[PDB]
Paper text:
We expressed and purified the NBD2 Walker B mutant [name] [name] in the [name] DSY5 strain and in the Materials and Methods section. After phosphorylation treatment with cAMP-PKA and size exclusion chromatography, cryo-EM grids were prepared as described in the Materials and Methods section. This approach yielded homogenous particles from which we identified a single inward-facing conformation in a 3.23 Å map. The overall conformation has previously been unobserved with a 40.0 Å separation between NBDs, ∼5 Å wider separation than the previous widest model (G668 on [name] and S1411 on NBD2). The high-quality map allowed the first-time modeling of four phosphorylation sites (S903, S908, T911, and S914) in a single [name] transporter R-domain. The S903 residue and its phosphate group make extensive interactions in a highly basic pocket defined by the surface of [name] (L619, K655, H803, K805, and K807) and R-insertion (615–643), especially at the K617 site, the latest being consistent with the R-insertion of CFTR in a proposed alternate conformation. Direct contacts amenable to ionic interaction are observed among three of the six residues in this cluster: the positively charged residues K617, K655, and K805 at 3.3, 3.4, and 2.5 Å respective distances to the phosphate oxygen group. The individual PKC, PKA, and CKII recognition motifs are shared by at least one residue to the next kinase motif in the R-domain sequence: R905 shared by PKC and PKA motif; S908 shared by PKA and CKII and T911 shared between two CKII motifs. This stabilized tetra-phosphorylated motif (PKC-PKA-CKII-CKII) makes a linear segment completely involved or bound to basic charges. The cryo-EM maps of the enriched tetra-phosphorylated [name] also reveal a continuous R-domain density that encloses entirely around [name] in a path resembling previously published [name] structures.
ATP-binding cassette ([name]) transporters catalyze the translocation of a wide range of substrates across membranes and support a variety of physiological processes including ion homeostasis, adaptative immune responses, lipid distribution, and detoxification. They consist of two cytosolic nucleotide-binding domains (NBDs) that can bind and hydrolyze ATP which promotes conformational changes in their transmembrane domains (TMDs). The ABCC family also expands the canonical [name] architecture with the addition of a long disordered link between [name] and TMD2 called the regulatory domain (R-domain) in some ABCC transporters. Some of the relevant transporters included in this family are CFTR, involved in chloride ion homeostasis; multidrug resistance protein 1 (MRP1) involved in the secretion of leukotrienes and drugs; the sulfonylurea receptor 1 (SUR1) a potassium channel that regulates insulin secretion; and the [name], which is responsible for heavy metal and drug detoxification in yeast.
Residue numbers in the entry: 1 to 332, 335 to 857, 882 to 891, 900 to 1515
């Protein structure tokens, strides 16, 4: 059948070169250029030209005129010029050349095509926004086609000495190349001009439009539209407003509606619906396009080793013929020698393959990640929309955390599947190509290498498993250390007061240095083994394959069988290793689809549960009618739980209808029926007008108080103030610091229940709804406040007198004013009627509940304070949400000077042993150098085989080659062991010890000002990053950096002229690296912060589904969810394309390196010095450089993100410590305090330098062993006297003398240790009872038991567990009562052998019985100690022998209790009169 075609092809082409694709000279033949490339591009231009022409003529003119400029006349001029040259070329055809059908058909088709192009340029300029894709590809293909025609003509002239179309044909084709190139540049480069008219509307847009929509096809391929964003993010920090809008197809509303339409189509039109089929039906097209580009990428990827094989064969045969003919120049026709130009065009073919592979690869990634974003947006919005209509049976079925995790986890899993979906076929497809390539290259010996890779797969999996086990144990010890630090920080006050810093620091170091770092050493060793395995296996595949080849095959192991084999094995390594990841992704995704499908199929609310209708007009009209013996069920499956039975409820406009009964008696169910939450099995139900609703639990959004009251309604100053006054919220609003601007709920200030209920009701009144459904709002409200609410809101004289009101409450006050009552017992309404009817019908129980109940500043404050038909509220325009990050902008005050803080890197290098860092870098060089010399020996081995034509001394060459591979592998083993054992672990031990010693030594002002959570975060997260992650990133960076440096010097050694290529590419590489570093880091930050509000909002919605469904604000809440999805995706879209912007440039740079190495090598072949080994070795290394450039840029980003952890750690390490703990010469005697003589010498102090004085000129002198009471008003600084005594805050003026030695000269340890304390903040450390009494183990157990006996704590300690002192205590002392903690603090205090005690009870009022026993123990046991008593209540002070009166930091009165009471005008007496003690006295 095909025999006719073979003969028919001979008739078309008459040139002796033939129709074949590649000529003898390595270029496209004349018949192939004219017959195929130019004809196909002409047919392409014709069929797609007229396609676009009819489309652009059918399409309506948009009205946006583009100004006719020098662009359009230049394009039309050059296209006319091109038509002229094609005409002249047609005339230049000779008589013999007319015989070729191909060339005449080429000029005919090109001439016809140019008229279509001439028209389409005009239509494109007039109407099309972007430069038309068809024109750009047409001029690209004809630039290529005419350039190939030029090179063909020039090669035939140079080698054969005849112009194949005359000099005229050469000159015309030269001008056609120049004309086509200039038309391509004028089409692609210049920006489209615009008329001045339409620019007035550019101020309406909020954000700039996406440049992707305006990007022509070359810009889309090269991703050059990202370049402007990269320059912006390099130059400054990216604010949210800088990010462009999403492209037109990415809106969450459009995607969700598309997937919703497909999904409900599956539900309706199939008996076995599947969510997966719906997804793959609606987003399946671009995945097919991605698969097509992946197939092209695989073919082009595996073309490169074959071109390398061709080139090495060419260089071998070129040198062979030079040596053969030069050695036989003695003789006198020789065949046509190999042309050197064939080498250059092979070198250029490698560039074209690398460039095309780069382009299709990133178009594959573009379509893949775009599909991932589409599936994420569509599923997220569908999940939210399904949440609003979940039946309460379904809502109670599943927990809130699981439903949020559907959005947060499962959708993220399906997004990740889209990345790896194409590898199910591309993996086998790449493997099948590679095995076929290797089989033809090496024969049967390939299978030994494949067996080794397959065998080493489970070994890799086993190492990953045990690595995961070690990582989990590392995380467990991290949590252990974090919890210990948390207890230390939370109880830092007691820790400093008792001088317990040393034992708890020793406890922390025992955990750290004994368990965590020991486990980290094990992790380091196993990572070293993993690195050794990853380094030896790529060698061992090639070494074993060549070993088996040489003995079994008689063929010579030449270079072409070796370096292409190494490249092919390297390409084989990746796809054979990703398959376990792909399969794991599929299983995880299959689980996620199961979760989502089960979620979407949950039972939804019955829409017809109630007929909701427009409002009723007249007062007294029936706004609610439930009747006909209506029956409603809580659940339809599995249990038919009848919620309500025989309901006949009816309510009228303006009247207050009350539902009364026990909890669960049906009252909350009947309100749920009005909302339509319950399923209606029988009866009819109606509700008229807008509904406002209040849940029994007051649900509050986490926004502002004003946002909670408005709740999407427009602002109105009069009603906003009026409702605040009506709800008695003004006093509560005034007490709040920022008033209505205060944040609310979980993130903001927590509100008390009665205050919370008032805010919830205030929302309802502001809506001005037609019907009010109130599920017991007065339960958490005080009586007098409730009366105020009954007067102004609910009463007939209130705001809502004209509105319908339903109030399910049982309080007597509400029932008295209520119009009609309904009695509801256990889901059955017994009887209803007006309140007057029941009053005379006293025999019924409704009167009885009133009977048995029976019978000023707060009431006055509550009571401190026509308009026919209050018009309803207006819902405000939804508009658009913009994320708020103003605090973050304040943090980034630098505005991206962005120069690297090299002081951090040097400080970290000094944290590691700097000598060990040099050793670590040394073994990287030794590793790579041996690996490079391993290939050099392989080059020498292959050359010897090629020269001999056999395999002489196979054992000798193979043994030496094996030795160098093991040498390189052992160097990586020693590299990673030195990394973890010596460098990384030493730095982690050094940094953590430096930080803990500094933080524990820091003064109290540091702990007070800084949040405790922030300090704990730096102890946990930053140390974890330094231990596990920071060492990893440096090792990956230096290994790849040294790898590229050895790759460069190998190529330069083979061809010294390559230096001139590296320098321009080096500056471009650094130029792209810096732009990616700043921009991609900032885009990831924006992406991260924008993720969380979507989940927090959805969790917030789930709490208040009843409220949202009550007010019918579903559309508003749905819109808010859609807007927050787009805000996150607006940051995610440029973040992803940042990678493809970078990866295109680096692969382009890598492709140019391959061109430079190949072409300069062939230039060296003309000199005659080149050998087959040199081009094989240098060019083989050049192919691998593209991956290493990607690693270096990526690891630099990882280094910068993690190195800030070292900066934060050093920030706390540099904290200025307080006064020294010990002064060597000034240490007091062991007996000190000998007596307890306290003397103050004009003492004065401030809490902080910036704060005013809190003590002034204190001259207090305390006799030994006197009971001193401290009395003072709030804010007098009475509590500051405690801190002054222990030097917790330094003395601004004066000094304190305890037993004729000033404590200022005494170290803080000697001061704080020798004094007994019962602090205000009673605190319990996590640990044993023994740990909380004597962590230093200074005292015997008998003394401890005596202390527990005196504290009345001995029996309770024995009761907790049989072990006694070893009994554990929970974190924070949760197991112990608050009063018990006071006794425990008392147990600590009495055990200290010192003669001075200070007792602080400035706020201790929890319980009196624990106070009484504490008091009696103080009087009895502590007789010999000088006691200072700081007490809130004066009753504890009246028995004191001496009393200090502190007022405004001065010594107001220092008198006995009798003198104070005798002086009725004293400050102490007046304070007692305020407390009422004077009345008793």
């Amino acid at each position: 059948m095909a025999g006719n075609l073979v003969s028919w092809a001979c008739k078309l082409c008459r040139s002796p070169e033939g129709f074949g694709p590649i000529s003898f000279y390595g270029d496209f033949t004349q018949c192939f250029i004219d017959g195929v490339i130019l004809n196909l591009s002409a047919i392409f231009m014709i069929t797609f030209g007229i396609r676009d022409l009819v489309n652009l003529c059918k399409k309506k003119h948009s009205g946006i005129k583009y100004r006719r400029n020098w662009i359009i006349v230049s394009r039309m001029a050059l296209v006319l010029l091109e038509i002229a040259f094609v005409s002249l070329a047609s005339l230049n055809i000779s008589k013999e050349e007319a015989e070729n059908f191909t060339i005449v058909s080429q000029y005919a088709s090109t001439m016809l095509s140019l008229f279509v192009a001439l028209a389409l340029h005009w239509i494109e300029y007039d109407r099309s926004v972007v430069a038309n894709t068809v024109l750009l590809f047409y001029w690209l293909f004809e630039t290529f086609g005419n350039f190939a025609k030029l090179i063909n003509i020039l090669i035939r002239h140079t080698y054969e000495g005849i112009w194949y179309s005359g000099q005229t044909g050469f000159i015309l084709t030269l001008f056609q190349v120049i004309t086509c190139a200039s038309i391509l540049l004028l089409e692609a480069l210049p920006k489209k001009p615009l008329m001045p008219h339409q620019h007035i509307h550019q101020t309406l847009t909020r954000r700039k439009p996406n440049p992707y929509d305006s990007a022509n096809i070359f810009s889309r391929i090269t991703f050059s539209w990202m370049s402007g964003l990269m320059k912006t993010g390099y130059e400054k920090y990216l604010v949210e407003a800088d990010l462009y809008k999403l492209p037109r197809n990415f809106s969450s509303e459009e995607l969700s509606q598309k997937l919703e339409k497909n999904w409900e189509n599956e539900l309706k039109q199939k008996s076995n619906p599947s969510l997966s089929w719906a997804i793959c039906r609606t987003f399946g097209s671009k995945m097919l396009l991605a698969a097509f580009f992946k197939a092209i990428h695989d073919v082009l990827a595996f073309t490169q080793p074959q071109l390398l094989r061709i080139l090495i064969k060419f260089v071998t045969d070129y040198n062979s013929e030079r040596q053969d003919d030069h050695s036989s120049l003695q003789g006198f026709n020789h065949p046509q020698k190999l042309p050197i130009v064939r080498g250059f065009l092979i070198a250029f073919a490698m560039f074209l393959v690398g460039f095309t592979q780069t382009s299709v690869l990133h178009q594959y990634f573009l379509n893949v990640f775009n599909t991932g974003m589409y599936i994420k947006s569509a599923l997220t919005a569908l999940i939210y929309q399904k949440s609003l209509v979940l039946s309460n049976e379904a809502s109670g079925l599943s927990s809130t955390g699981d439903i949020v995790n559907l959005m947060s986890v499962d959708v993220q899993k399906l997004q990740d599947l889209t990345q790896w979906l194409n590898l199910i076929w591309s993996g086998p497809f790449q493997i099948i190509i590679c095995l076929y390539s290797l089989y033809k290259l090496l024969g049967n010996s390939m299978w030994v290498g494949v067996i080794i890779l397959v065998i080493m797969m489970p070994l890799n999996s086993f190492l990953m498993r045990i690595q995961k086990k070690l990582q989990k144990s590392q995380m467990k010890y991290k949590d252990e250390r974090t919890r210990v630090i948390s207890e230390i920080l939370n109880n830092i006050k007691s820790l400093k007061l008792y001088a317990w810093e040393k034992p708890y620091r020793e406890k922390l170091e025992e955990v750290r240095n004994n368990k965590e770092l020991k486990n980290l050493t094990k992790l380091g060793c196993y990572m070293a083994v993993t690195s050794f395995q990853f380094n030896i296996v790529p060698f061992l595949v090639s070494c074993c394959t060549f070993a088996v080849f040489v003995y079994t095959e008689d063929r010579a192991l030449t270079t072409d069988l070796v370096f292409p084999a190494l490249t092919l094995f390297n390409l084989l390594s990746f796809p054979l290793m990703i398959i376990p990841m792909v399969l794991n992704s599929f299983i995880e995704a299959s689980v996620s689809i199961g979760r989502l499908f089960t979620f979407f199929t949950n039972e939804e609310l019955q829409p017809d549960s109630v007929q909701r209708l427009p409002k009723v007009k007249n007062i007294g009209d029936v706004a609610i009618n439930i009747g006909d013996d209506a029956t409603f069920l809580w659940q339809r499956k599995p249990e038919y739980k009848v919620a309500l039975k025989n309901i006949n409820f009816q309510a009228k406009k303006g009247n207050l209808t009350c539902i009364v009964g026990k909890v669960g008696s049906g009252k909350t169910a009947l309100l749920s029926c009005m909302l339509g939450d319950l399923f209606r099995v029988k009866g009819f139900a109606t509700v008229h007008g807008s509904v406002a609703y209040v849940s029994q639990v007051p649900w509050i959004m986490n926004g502002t108080v004003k946002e909670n009251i408005l709740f999407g309604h427009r602002y109105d100053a009069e009603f906003y103030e009026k409702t605040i006054k009506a709800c008695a919220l003004t006093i509560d609003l005034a007490i709040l610091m920022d008033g209505d601007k205060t944040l609310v709920g979980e993130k903001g200030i927590s509100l008390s229940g009665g205050q919370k209920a008032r805010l919830s009701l205030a929302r309802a009144v502001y809506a001005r709804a037609d019907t009010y459904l109130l599920d017991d709002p007065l339960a958490a409200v005080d009586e007098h406040v409730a009366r105020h609410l009954i007067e102004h809101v609910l009463g007939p004289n209130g705001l809502l007198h004209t509105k319908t009101k339903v109030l399910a409450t049982n309080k007597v006050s509400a029932l008295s004013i209520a119009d009609s009552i309904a009695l509801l017992d256990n889901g059955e309404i017994t009887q209803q009627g007006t309140y007057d009817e029941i009053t005379k019908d006293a025999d019924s129980p409704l009167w009885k509940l009133l009977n048995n109940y029976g019978k000023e500043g707060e009431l006055e404050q509550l009571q401190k304070l026509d308009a026919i038909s209050l018009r309803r509220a207006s819902d405000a325009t939804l508009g658009s949400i913009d994320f708020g990050d103003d605090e973050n902008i304040a943090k980034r005050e630098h505005r991206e000077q962005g120069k690297v803080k090299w002081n951090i890197y040097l400080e970290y290098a000094k944290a590691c042993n700097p000598k060990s860092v040099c050793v670590f870098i040394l073994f990287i060089v030794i590793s790579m150098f041996l690996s490079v010399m391993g290939n050099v020996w392989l080059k020498h081995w292959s050359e010897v085989n090629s020269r001999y034509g056999s395999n002489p001394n196979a054992a000798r060459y193979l043994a030496i080659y094996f030795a160098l591979g093991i040498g390189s592998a052992l160097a990586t083993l020693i590299q990673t062991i030195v990394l973890w054992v010596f460098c990384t672990i030493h730095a982690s031990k050094y940094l953590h010890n430096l930080m803990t010693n500094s933080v524990l030594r820091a003064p109290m002002t540091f702990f007070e000002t800084t949040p405790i959570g922030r300090i704990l975060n730096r102890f946990s997260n930053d140390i974890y990053k330094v231990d596990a992650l920071l060492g990893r990133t440096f090792s990956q960076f230096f290994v790849n950096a040294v790898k590229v440096t050895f790759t460069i010097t190998v190529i330069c050694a083979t061809t010294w002229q390559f230096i001139f290529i590296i320098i321009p590419l080096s500056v471009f590489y650094i130029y792209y690296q810096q732009y990616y570093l700043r921009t991609s880091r900032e885009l990831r930050r924006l992406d991260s912060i924008t993720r969380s509000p979507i989940y927090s909002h959805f969790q917030e919605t789930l709490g208040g589904l009843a409220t949202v469904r009550g007010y019918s604000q579903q559309k508003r809440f749905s819109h808010i969810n859609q807007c927050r999805i787009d805000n996150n995706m607006s940051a995610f879209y440029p973040s992803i394309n940042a990678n493809r912007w970078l990866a295109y440039r680096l692969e382009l740079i890598g492709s140019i390196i391959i061109l430079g190495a190949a072409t300069l090598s062939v230039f060296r072949l003309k000199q005659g010095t080149l050998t087959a080994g040199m081009v094989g070795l240098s060019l083989s290394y050049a192919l691998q450089i593209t991956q290493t450039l990607n690693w270096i840029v990526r690891m630099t980003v990882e280094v910068e993100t993690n190195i800030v952890s070292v900066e934060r750690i050093k920030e706390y390490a540099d904290l200025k410590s307080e006064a020294p703990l010990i002064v060597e010469g000034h240490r007091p005697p062991k007996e000190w305090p000998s007596q307890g003589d306290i003397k103050f010498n004009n003492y004065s102090t401030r809490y902080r330098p910036e704060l005013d004085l809190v003590l002034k000129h204190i001259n207090i002198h305390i006799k030994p062993n006197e009971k001193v009471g401290i009395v003072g008003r709030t804010g007098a600084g009475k509590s500051s006297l405690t801190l002054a005594l222990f030097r917790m805050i330094e003395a601004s003026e004066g000094n304190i003398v305890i037993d004729n030695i000033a404590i200022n000269e005494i170290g803080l340890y000697d001061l704080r240790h020798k004094l007994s304390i019962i602090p205000q903040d009673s605190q319990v450390f996590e640990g044993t009872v023994r740990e909380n009494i004597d962590p230093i183990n200074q005292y015997t157990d008998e003394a401890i038991w005596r202390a527990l006996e005196l504290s009345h704590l001995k029996e309770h300690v024995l009761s907790m567990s049989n072990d006694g002192l070893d009994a554990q205590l929970t974190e924070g002392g949760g197991n112990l009562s608050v009063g018990q903690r006071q006794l425990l603090c008392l147990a600590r205090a009495m055990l200290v052998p010192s003669k001075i005690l200070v007792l602080d009870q400035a706020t201790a009022a929890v319980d009196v019985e624990t106070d009484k026993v504490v008091q009696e123990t103080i009087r009895t046991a502590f007789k010999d100690r000088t006691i200072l008593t700081i007490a809130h209540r004066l009753n504890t002070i009246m028995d004191s022998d001496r009393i200090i009166v502190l007022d405004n930091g001065k010594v107001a009165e220092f008198d006995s209790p009798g003198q104070l009471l005798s002086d009725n005008k004293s400050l102490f007496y007046s304070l007692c009169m305020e407390a009422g003690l004077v009345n008793e006295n």
